[PDB]
Design a protein around this ligand. Structure first.
Ligand SMILES: O=C(Nc1nc2cccc(-c3ccc(CN4CCS(=O)(=O)CC4)cc3)n2n1)C1CC1
Length: 272
């Protein structure tokens, strides 16, 4: 990671919190191309001091996203580890997390918009699968909207996938259960089962979110009931807009070996 000075970072408004983290919009003062000085908008992710013992995993997650370069992956700019802080410095995506956007703009998102976003997410995941690189936390809140759809110019929306955060392989069990049905059944049974097939399952859950206007599946179930949901081998209900329900259920296969490749997922999406 590139090291960024604390004095070059300005923390501004809170964007909420993640698991053991707080997130802010900020500004990074930097020398850019041609030596020009810039004050660049950045996403600042801060590991809670009380959870400093996760620092390794915290940075490993981000390092995953910098292992490769791709148009659908959020950029890491660097880290600030001055003093008692563990800070990730990332690209700031103008329109933010997709679940919030879906909840706010549900009354004007149609099947074509959803198909474009689904195809872009699948393209990103196909890139990761070809590189045998596990993401491990695919979900709508980790999809960021770079550009809105502009039908006046035919321009489709454009999204990127953000870093997965601290890995489910080290998180407490109660958090994993709260993350049902994004965390697949085999990872509830054993978080060390994290594998490429994990991201196919979570991709299914994320499509469900995209089709459900930002609703969270199984939100009315407490952790014990989410566990039993897996134990009874239930599937998610079809969204009212049911165009992707079969793909959702095919990806959310309780047999990890049977989940379709992302190449096959993309072929399916292109057939609609
Ligand atoms: O937020 C914006 N851009 C932006 N860029 C990036 C780049 C990387 C990561 C993020 C990001 C920020 C926050 C979150 C969690 N978060 C908590 C409250 S929640 O309501 O559940 C919606 C999601 C998740 C991802 N972001 N976010 C624009 C709208 C102001």
């Amino acid at each position: 990671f590139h090291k960024i000075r604390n004095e070059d970072l300005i923390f501004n408004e809170s964007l909420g919190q993640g698991t053991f983290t707080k997130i802010f919009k900020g500004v990074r003062r930097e020398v850019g191309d041609y030596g020009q000085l810039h004050e660049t908008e950045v996403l600042l992710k801060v590991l809670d001091k009380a959870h400093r013992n996760y620092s390794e995993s915290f940075f490993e997650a981000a390092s995953m996203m910098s292992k490769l370069s791709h148009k659908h992956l959020v950029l890491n700019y660097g880290v600030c580890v001055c003093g008692d802080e563990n800070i990730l410095v990332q690209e700031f995506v103008k329109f933010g997390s997709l679940d919030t956007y879906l909840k706010k703009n549900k009354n004007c998102i149609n099947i074509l918009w959803k198909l474009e976003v689904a195809k872009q997410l699948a393209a990103a995941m196909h890139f990761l699968e070809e590189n045998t690189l596990i993401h491990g936390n695919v979900c709508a809140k980790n999809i960021l909207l770079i550009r809105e759809e502009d039908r006046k110019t035919g321009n489709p929306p454009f999204i990127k996938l953000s870093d997965p955060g601290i890995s489910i392989t080290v998180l407490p069990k109660d958090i994993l259960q709260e993350r049902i049905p994004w965390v697949p059944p085999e990872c509830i049974e054993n978080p060390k089962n994290l594998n490429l097939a994990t991201d196919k399952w979570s991709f299914g859950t994320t499509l469900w979110e995209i089709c459900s206007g930002g609703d969270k599946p199984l939100s009315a179930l407490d952790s014990q009931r989410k566990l039993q949901f897996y134990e009874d081998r239930h599937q998610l209900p079809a969204p009212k807009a049911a165009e992707l329900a079969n793909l959702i259920n095919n990806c959310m296969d309780y047999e990890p070996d049977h989940r379709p490749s992302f190449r096959a997922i993309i072929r399916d999406l292109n057939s609609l």
